[PDB]
A paper describes a structure:
Transporters of the Nramp (Natural resistance-associated macrophage protein) family import divalent transition metal ions into cells of most organisms. In addition to the physiological substrates Fe2+ and Mn2+, Nramps can also transport toxic metals like Cd2+ and Hg2+ but exclude the abundant alkaline earth metals like Mg2+ and Ca2+. Recent bacterial Nramp structures reveal a LeuT fold, three stable conformations (outward-open, occluded, and inward-open), and identify the metal-binding site residues, including conserved aspartate, asparagine, and methionine residues. We present high-resolution structures of DraNramp in three conformations in both Mn2+-bound and metal-free states, providing the first molecular map of the entire Mn2+ transport cycle.
Two new structures of DraNramp point-mutants reveal the coordination of Mn2+ in the inward-open state: M230A•Mn2+ and D296A•Mn2+ (Cα RMSD of 0.42 Å). As in the occluded state, the Mn2+ binds D56, N59, and the A227 carbonyl, with a water replacing M230 in M230A•Mn2+. However, with TM1a displaced, the A53 carbonyl no longer coordinates Mn2+; instead, the Y54 carbonyl approaches Mn2+ at a longer distance of 3.1 Å. Two more waters, one bound to Q378 and another from the inner vestibule, complete a seven-coordination sphere resembling a pentagonal bipyramidal geometry with substantial distortion. Seven coordination is infrequent but found in Mn2+-coordinating proteins like MntR. TM1a swings to a similar angle in the new inward-open M230A•Mn2+ as in the previous low-resolution inward-open metal-free structure, and structures of the homologous Eggerthella lenta Nramp-related magnesium transporter (EleNRMT), LeuT, and serotonin transporter. However, in M230A•Mn2+ H232 flips to interact with the G330 carbonyl (TM8), suggesting that it may transiently move during the conformational cycle. Mn2+ is present at the external site in the inward-open M230A•Mn2+, and consistently, the ITC data fit a two-site model (Kd1=215±65 µM assigned to the orthosteric site, Kd2=4600±1300 µM for the external site). M230 is thus a crucial ligand for Cd2+ but not Mn2+, which is further reflected in the transport behavior where M230A affects Cd2+ transport drastically but has negligible effect on Mn2+. The occluded and inward-open states may be energetically similar as relatively small perturbations yielded inward-open structures (M230A•Mn2+ and D296A•Mn2+).
Author numbering: 45 to 436
Write the structure that this text describes.
C-alpha cells in the first residue's frame, strides 16, 4: 500500500526520539505540534511532488539551471548540512538499537552499522526488495502497536484534548516542538521527493500530469494521516507511561520499550529495538542515496558513494567518543533540520508558482499563500527558539 510504504519511510529514528521525549517530559501538551507539522508536511510534499510532475526536474536541478552560481553553491552547502544532520540521527539510531539488542558499546554499534550500511549500498535494487518489505513489516506493526496501546493505556482525555490547543511552555518545549517539526517536515525529502516524481509520467501530456498529481495527493495525505496518528499515539503512550511518574531516564530511547510492555510483555524490548534498527538502517541508506542525488542536482557532479558514506559517519563516531547521550543528539539533529526547512521552501514556493516551470500545473494562488504562511510560521518558531537559546 502507498500509505503503508510512505509512513514507514517517514518513521525515522528522529521521530522515535522526539515522540518519546516529548510525551514523557511534556505530557500531551505537544500533540498540536505533531498535528500541525503533519498538515504542513502534506502541503509541502504535495508541492515538491507537483514540481517533479510538471517540470520533470528535481528542486536541486532547477536551482542549478536558473539561479546564479554563488547562490547555487550556498544552497548546495546547506543541503549538504541537511544531509549530515539527517544521517546523524539515522546512523546513530541504528547503532543505539544494536546496543539495545546485543549490548555492544556504542562505538562497536556504529562499526556494525557502518559495515551494514556500506554493504547495503553495493546491493542492487532487486536484492533490497525483500529487505524493503522486511523493514516495512517491523516498523508498520510497531506503529499499529502504539495505535492499539493508546486506546488500552486509558489516557486522560481531558489532558489529551487540551494538548491540541497550541501552548509553548517555555524554551524547553519550544526546543522539542522545533525538533518535532524537523522530524516530520524532512527537508531532505523536500529536495528528493521531486526526484521520485521526475519521470513518473508514462508519456508527456497535461492529462497524465493532472492524473499523477491526483494520485500523488491521495497517497501522500493517506500516508501522512497514518503517520500522524502513529506519531501522536507514540507521544501519547509515552505521556501515559512516564509523564508525572518521575521515572529514571524517562524519554530516553533505552527505556522507551516500557511504553509497549503492557501490550507486548517481555517482547517489548526486542520488538522496539528491532524496529529502531530497521528504521535506522533503511533511512540511513536512502538518505545517503538521496544526498548523492542532491549533489548531482546542484553541481552536476558527485563524489564517490563510498566517500560520502565515510564522511557522514564521522559526526556519529565523534559524538560516541565524546560520551554524548544518543537520544539527545537525535533530537538535536531534528532541530537543526528544522532550520533547513525555510531554505528549502523558498525555491519550492517560487518555482511552483511560475508558468515557465509548471506550465498548466501552476499551483493554486491560495495554496501558494498557505505555503508562505507555513514558511513564516517555521521561521518564527525557529527564531523564537533560537532567541531563548541566547536569553529572552
Ligand atoms: C552483517 C550482519 C551481521 C552482523 C555482523 C557484522 C559484520 C561485520 C562485523 C565486524 C566486526 C564487528 C563485530 C563486533 C566487534 C568485534 C569485537 C568485539 O566484539 O568487542 C567487544 C568488546 O566488548 C569491546 O571491548
Ligand atoms: C498549519 C497550516 C495548516 C495547513 C493546511 C492544510 C491544508 C490541507 C492540504 C493538503 C494537501 C494540499 C495539496 C495542495 C495541492 C496544490 C496543487 C495546486 O494548487 O494545483 C496545481 C496543479 O494541480 C499541480 O501542480
Ligand atoms: C548555514 C547555511 C550553510 C552555510 C553556507 C556558508 C557558505 C556559503 C556558500 C558559499 C559562500 C558564498 C558564495 C561564494 C562561493 C561560491 C562560488 C561562486 O560560484 O561565486 C563566487 C562569488 O561569490 C561570485 O560572486
Ligand atoms: C541475535 C541477537 C543475539 C544477541 C547477541 C548476544 C546477546 C547478549 C546479551 O546478553 O543480550 C544483550 C543484552 O541483554 C541487551 O539487552
Ligand atoms: C492522542 C490522540 C492520537 C490519535 C489516536 C489515533 C487513533 C485512535 C484509535 C487507534 C486505532 C486502533 C484501534 C485500537 C483498538 O481497536 O484497540 C481495541 C482494544 O483491543 C480493545 O479496546
Ligand atoms: C482511549 C483512546 C483515546 C484516543 C485519544 C483521542 C481522544 C479524542 C480527542 C481528545 C478528546 C476530546 C476532549 C475530551 C475532553 O474530555 O475534554 C473536554 C473538552 O473541554 C471539550 O471541549
Ligand atoms: C477550515 C475549518 C477550520 C479548521 C478546523 C479546526 C478549527 C480551528 C481552526 C483552525 C485550526 C488551527 C487553529 C486552532 C488553534 C486555535 C487558534 C490559535 O492558534 O491560538 C492558539 C491558542 O488559542 C492560544 O492560546
Ligand atoms: C541548515 C540550518 C540553517 C542554519 C541557520 C541556523 C542554524 C542554527 C541551527 C541550530 C541552532 C539550535 C541549536 C540547539 C542547541 C540547544 C542545545 C539543547 O540541548 O537545548 C536544550 C533545550 O533548551 C532544552 O532541552
Ligand atoms: C494528520 C492527521 C492526524 C489526525 C488528527 C487526529 C486529531 C484531530 C484533532 C483533534 C482535536 C480534538 C480535541 C480538541 C478539544 C480541545 C479541548 C480544549
Ligand atoms: C488516515 C489513515 C489512513 C490509513 C489507515 C490504515 C489503517 C491501518 C492501521 C490499522 C490499525 C487497526 C488496529 C487493529 C485492531 C486492533 C484490535
Ligand atoms: C516467533 C518469534 C516471536 C518471539 C520474538 C520476540 C520474543 C522476545 C523474547 C524474549 C525477550 C528477551 C529479553 C529478556 C526479557 C526482556 C523483558 C524485560 O523486562 O526487559 C528488560 C530489559 O532488557 C532491561 O533493560
Ligand atoms: C574496524 C575497527 C575500528 C578501529 C579503527 C579502524 C581504523 C580505520 C578507519 C577508517 C577506515 C575506513 C574504511 C572504509
Ligand atoms: C573524511 C575525510 C576524507 C576521507 C577519505 C579518505 C578515507 C579513505 C580510506 C578508506 C576508504 C577507501 C575506499 C576505497 C574505495 C575504492 C574505490 C576506488 O577505486 O577509488 C576510485 C574512486 O574513489 C571511485 O571510483
Ligand atoms: C495561521 C493559521 C494556520 C495557517 C493557515 C493560514 C491560512 C491563510 C490563508 C488561507 C487561504 C487563503 C485565502 C486567500 C486566497 C487568495 C487567492
Ligand atoms: C510577512 C511576514 C509577516 C507575517 C504575516 C505572514 C504573511 C504571509 C503572507 C505572505 C504570502 C505572500 C505570497 C503569496 C502570494 C503569491 O505569491 O502568489 C502569487 C504568485 O506569485 C503568482 O502565481
Ligand atoms: C517572524 C516572522 C517572519 C520574519 C521574517 C520575515 C520573512 C517573511 C518571509 C516571507 C514573507 C512573504 C514573502 C512572499 C514573497 C512572494 C514573492 C513572489 O511571489 O514572487 C516574487 C519573486 O521574487 C519573483 O522572482
Ligand atoms: C534558519 C531558518 C530560520 C531562520 C531564523 C530567523 C530568526 C529571526 C527571524 C524571525 C524572528 C522570530 C520572531 C519571533 C516572534 C516573537 C517576536 C515578537 O513579535 O514579540 C512579540 C511581541 O511583540 C512582544 O510583546
Ligand atoms: C522576542 C521573541 C520571543 C519573546 C516574545 C515572547 C515571550 C515568551 C517567551 C519568553 C520566555 O519564556 O523566556 C524565558 C527564558 O527563556 C527562560 O524561561
Ligand atoms: Cl526563477
Ligand atoms: Cl496532565
Ligand atoms: Mn522523519
Ligand atoms: Mn540514551
Amino acid at each position: 500500500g502507498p500509505a503503508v510504504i510512505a509512513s514507514i519511510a517517514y518513521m525515522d529514528p528522529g521521530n522515535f526520539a522526539t515522540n518519546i521525549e516529548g510525551g514523557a517530559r511534556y505530557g500531551y501538551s505537544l500533540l498540536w505540534v505533531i498535528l500541525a507539522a503533519n498538515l504542513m508536511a502534506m502541503v509541502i510534499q504535495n508541492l515538491s511532488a507537483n514540481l517533479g510532475i510538471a517540470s520533470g526536474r528535481n528542486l536541486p536541478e532547477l536551482i542549478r539551471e536558473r539561479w546564479p552560481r554563488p547562490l547555487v553553491w550556498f544552497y548546495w552547502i546547506q543541503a549538504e548540512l541537511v544531509a549530515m544532520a539527517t544521517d546523524l540521527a539515522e546512523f546513530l539510531g541504528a547503532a543505539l538499537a544494536i546496543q539495545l539488542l546485543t549490548g555492544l558499546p556504542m562505538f562497536w554499534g556504529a562499526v556494525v552499522t557502518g559495515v551494514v550500511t556500506f554493504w547495503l549500498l553495493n546491493l542492487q535494487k532487486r536484492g533490497t526488495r525483500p529487505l524493503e518489505l522486511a523493514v516495512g513489516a517491523f516498523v508498520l506493526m510497531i506503529g499499529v502497536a502504539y495505535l492499539v496501546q493508546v486506546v488500552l493505556a486509558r489516557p486522560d482525555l481531558a489532558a489529551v484534548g487540551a494538548g491540541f490547543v497550541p501552548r509553548l511552555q517555555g524554551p524547553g518545549s519550544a526546543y522539542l516542538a522545533v525538533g518535532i517539526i524537523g522530524a516530520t517536515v524532512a527537508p531532505h525529502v523536500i529536495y528528493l521527493h521531486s526526484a521520485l516524481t521526475q519521470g513518473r509520467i508514462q508519456t508527456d501530456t497535461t492529462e497524465e500530469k493532472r492524473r499523477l498529481v491526483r494520485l500523488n495527493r491521495v497517497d501522500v495525505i493517506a500516508a501522512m494521516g497514518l503517520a500522524g496518528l502513529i506519531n501522536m499515539s507514540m507521544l501519547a503512550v509515552a505521556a501515559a507511561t512516564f509523564h508525572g511518574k518521575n521515572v529514571e531516564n524517562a524519554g530516553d530511547l533505552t527505556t522507551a520499550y516500557q511504553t509497549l510492555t503492557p501490550l507486548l510483555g517481555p517482547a517489548a524490548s526486542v520488538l522496539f529495538a528491532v524496529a529502531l534498527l530497521a528504521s535506522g538502517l533503511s533511512s540511513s541508506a536512502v538518505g545517503t542515496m538521496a544526498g548523492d542525488v542532491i549533489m548531482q542536482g546542484f553541481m552536476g557532479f558527485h563524489i564517490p558513494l563510498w566517500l560520502r558514506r565515510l564522511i557522514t559517519m564521522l559526526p556519529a563516531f565523534i559524538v560516541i567518543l565524546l560520551g554524548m547521550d544518543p537520544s539527545s543528539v537525535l533530537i538535536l539533529s531534528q532541530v537543526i533540520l528544522c532550520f533547513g526547512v525555510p531554505f528549502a521552501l523558498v525555491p519550492l514556493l517560487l518555482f511552483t508558482a511560475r508558468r515557465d516551470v509548471m506550465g498548466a500545473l501552476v499551483t493554486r494562488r491560495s495554496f501558494t499563500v498557505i505555503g508562505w504562511v507555513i514558511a513564516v510560521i517555521i521561521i518564527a518558531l525557529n527564531g523564537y527558539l533560537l532567541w531563548e537559546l541566547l536569553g529572552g
